[PDB]
Amino acid sequence: SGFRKMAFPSGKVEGCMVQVTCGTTTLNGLWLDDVVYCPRHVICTSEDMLNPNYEDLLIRKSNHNFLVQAGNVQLRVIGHSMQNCVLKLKVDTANPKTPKYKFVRIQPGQTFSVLACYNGSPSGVYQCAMRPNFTIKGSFLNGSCGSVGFNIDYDCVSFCYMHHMVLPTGVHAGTDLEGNFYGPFVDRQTAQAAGTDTTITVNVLAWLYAAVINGDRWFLNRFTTTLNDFNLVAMKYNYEPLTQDHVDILGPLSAQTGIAVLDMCASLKELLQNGMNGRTILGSALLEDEFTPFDVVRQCSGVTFQ
Amino acid sequence: SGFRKMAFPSGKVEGCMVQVTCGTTTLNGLWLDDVVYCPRHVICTSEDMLNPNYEDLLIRKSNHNFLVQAGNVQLRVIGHSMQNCVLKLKVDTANPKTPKYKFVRIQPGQTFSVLACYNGSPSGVYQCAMRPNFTIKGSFLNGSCGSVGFNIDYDCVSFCYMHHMVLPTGVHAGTDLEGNFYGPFVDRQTAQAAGTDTTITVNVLAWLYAAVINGDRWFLNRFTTTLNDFNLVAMKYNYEPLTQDHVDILGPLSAQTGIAVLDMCASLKELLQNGMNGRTILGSALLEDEFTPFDVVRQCSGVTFQ
Ligand SMILES: *[C@H](O)[C@H](C[C@@H]1CCNC1=O)NC(=O)[C@H](CC(C)C)NC(=O)OCc1ccccc1
Ligand SMILES: *[C@H](O)[C@H](C[C@@H]1CCNC1=O)NC(=O)[C@H](CC(C)C)NC(=O)OCc1ccccc1
């Protein structure tokens, strides 16, 4: 009963959040095994951020210039390296709360949970989606960098995101845990464009399937459509083109509810052309695109983790 | 930058979730010190739930009839009692992961985080509000009972909610940690009415203040109003009557943004009478009422916890 935008239990990630200062800049770090990961602009002064030469800036930095604090105790830095836009601080103490983890470069349209932190302490947890334009719509203030996004599979934490900056439009940009930015973004204080953000069409359809499962069915029509004719409406409304892979991913939900994918596409077509007439679906007046088909199955069947 | 419905870090609560079975019924329990708290209908069979006599049902139950599992190890039950609609199972082992905690009966309009669990294992975490009619709009399936709602103050966990049942309208009902139901609800399988749910007016105003802080200002008008004239619009649109206490709680946000409370009430009045004209505020097409004034200050200033 009910459908909510819920996030993973963040307990396994809270144990990995540390505080990292270099000079006057302080941000968060990810402590896994004997390595601490954090954005590389921790070495930047307020002036350096306009056009930083990270190679020249890092060279004037030694191990003792990095203050890594895990709660009450410090970590002795015994090595540092720069991998893309992230620093890897080698410490002498392995994190005893290190969970089973791996690094994953997420795909556009997929979702993950963000644990927003400040000064190495967690502040909150929320669910976001990697937009098609490789941005996210999160809640990040000054000091939030180094906060990580992740997914949980039973006991395996798949880290996929690390926050770095906000764009002029208010959306946020970051990297994977190997330091590669999602999108055409660079870690420099300059006006960067994210481009036209389209709607994750497969996610909208999966959300409409969750609505029928929960009792909202007023949007179910008596029409059908073709992939090509739907994508003619989709492209006009800045929606992702639907593919046969997208149809196959929506397969299990289509068989469960007995509603063909193309029939659900026709219901979504009328919604784009006629609006919503002041009505709501699952308590929303807009078409939600931050629930993937796997997020619908997980919440509607009660999948748990460690 | 950005405003999201974020939940507290659930790490301190994950360590307290256990599994409780009595007969064939299995639900979640809250393990604090040497006591396990769980809903009392764990002693009910599928037939008993229609009209249970918990006094007569509990009397035929002994300590060994309660299977309390905390992950891989069992807890030896050495005592049981019934406090209102919750059972207090005394165990021989104090939970080593017990955080600083206390029990709080939340007020209508306040918010808290829910950690949805199944079989004693966390499944997800989301933020909800205690509606004026003492219901919540959560995501709860079969097996979710015993899941708890809570707030975190630095290192103190204030447990305030325990899930018990869903209503015919799809909303959920539960108790405090002393077993007293929020609302006129009883733990029995029967059609129970929740009454007219009104909108938390002070929460809507605090959300509009968060919008101005984040850049959404199109709803700011050039009118003003009186508490009485606003409440004339409020009562018509099923909104909570605004009081001087509500104005005082919105004080710090009013002084921060330089917008008088009554002026913000006038902007909210026009929104109720004219709708939204297909526009969005903070990415929503509806007026959000699940952010309290304290939830706005916390997210817009970066308050952290342990
Ligand atoms: C790191 O904590 C911080 C996060 C920002 C601060 C406010 N909201 C956020 O998401 N990121 C930065 O300070 C970043 C540093 C660069 C070296 C990457 N700069 C940044 O986010 O500037 C915002 C901006 C840049 C250019 C045009 C408009 C805005
Ligand atoms: C406990 O896990 C369960 C939670 C329900 C199951 C589906 N969604 C939920 O929130 N609660 C119950 O099973 C509860 C047991 C009573 C003894 C309190 N009964 C219940 O929720 O029944 C739902 C209902 C009752 C009457 C009319 C319409 C629906």
Q: Which residues of B touch A170 (CB under 8 A)?
A: 1-2, 214-215
Say if A62 falls within a structural domain.
yes
**B11, B126, B172 ranked by CB distance to A10: nearest:** B11
Instruction: Reduce the secondary structure of chain A to three states and give it as a string.
Output: CCCCCCECCCHHHHCCEEEEEECCEEEEEEEECCEEEEEHHHHCCCCHHHCCCHHHHHHCCCHHHEEEEECCEEECEEEEEEECCEEEEEECCCCCCCCEEEECCCCCCCEEEEEEEECCEEEEEEEEECCCCCCECCCCCCCCCCCEEEEEECCEEEEEEEEEEECCCCCEEEECCCCCECCCCCCCCCCCCCCCCCECHHHHHHHHHHHHHHCCCCCCCCCCCCHHHHHHHHHHCCECCCCHHHHHHCHHHHHHHCCCHHHHHHHHHHHHHHCCCCCCECCECCCCCCCCHHHHHHHHHCCCCC
Last residue of a domain, one of A62, A91, A120: A91
Cα–Cα distance measured from residue B11 to residue B3, given in angstroms and rounded to the nearest whole number: 23
Q: Which domain holds residue B208?
A: 201-301
Say if A220 falls within a structural domain.
yes
∠ CA B195-B196-B199, nearest 5°, is: 135
CATH of the domain at B62: 2.40.10.10
Cα–Cα distance measured from residue B156 to residue B151, given in angstroms and rounded to the nearest whole number: 8
DSSP B77: E
Amino acid at A91: V
Question: What's the gap in Å between B168 CA and the centre of ligand 2?
Answer: 9
Handedness of CA A107, A110, A113, A118 (dihedral sign): positive
φ, ψ for residue B257 (rounded to 5)? Answer: -85, -5
Active site (annotated) includes residue B164: no
How far off is chain B from A215, nearest CA to CA, in Å? 9
Say if B114 falls within a structural domain.
no
Resolution (A): 2.4
Domains in chain A, number: 2
What is the phi-psi region of residue A164: left when phi exceeds 0, alpha when psi lies from -120 to 50, beta otherwise?
alpha
DSSP B86: E
Ligand 2: which of B24, B140, B165, B187 to mutate, judged by most atoms within 8 Å of the beta carbon? B165
Say if A115 falls within a structural domain.
no
Cα–Cα distance measured from residue A112 to residue A8, given in angstroms and rounded to the nearest whole number: 8
Active site (annotated) includes residue B16: no
Using a 6 Å cutoff on CB, does residue A175 contact ligand 1? no
Say if A255 falls within a structural domain.
yes
Cα–Cα distance measured from residue A299 to residue B141, given in angstroms and rounded to the nearest whole number: 9
Last residue of a domain, one of B58, B91, B124: B91
Is B33 in contact with B95 (CB distance < 8 Å)?
Answer: yes
Say if A178 falls within a structural domain.
no
Greatest Cα-to-Cα distance within chain A, rounded to the nearest angstrom:
69
Q: Which two tokens stand for residue A85?
A: 């836009």
Amino acid at B293: P
CATH of the domain at A238: 1.10.1840.10
Residue whose tokens read 């209503």: B167
Last residue of a domain, one of A91, A124, A141: A91
Residue whose tokens read 């003619």: A232
Element of type H or E holding B127:
strand B121-129
Strand B121-129, strand A172-175: pairing:
unpaired
DSSP B197: P
Say if A45 falls within a structural domain.
yes
Greatest Cα-to-Cα distance within chain B, rounded to the nearest angstrom:
69
Cα–Cα distance measured from residue A242 to residue A196, given in angstroms and rounded to the nearest whole number: 18
Cα–Cα distance measured from residue A168 to residue B255, given in angstroms and rounded to the nearest whole number: 26
Element of type H or E holding B233:
helix B227-236
How far off is chain B from A247, nearest CA to CA, in Å? 26
Question: What's the gap in Å between A136 CA and the centre of ligand 1?
Answer: 14
- Smallest Cα–Cα separation from B263: which of B219, B213, B223? B223
Q: Which two tokens stand for residue B182?
A: 């929020």
Nearest CA owner, ligand 1 atom 28:
A168
- Smallest Cα–Cα separation from B91: which of B82, B99, B80, B100? B80
Say if B41 falls within a structural domain.
yes
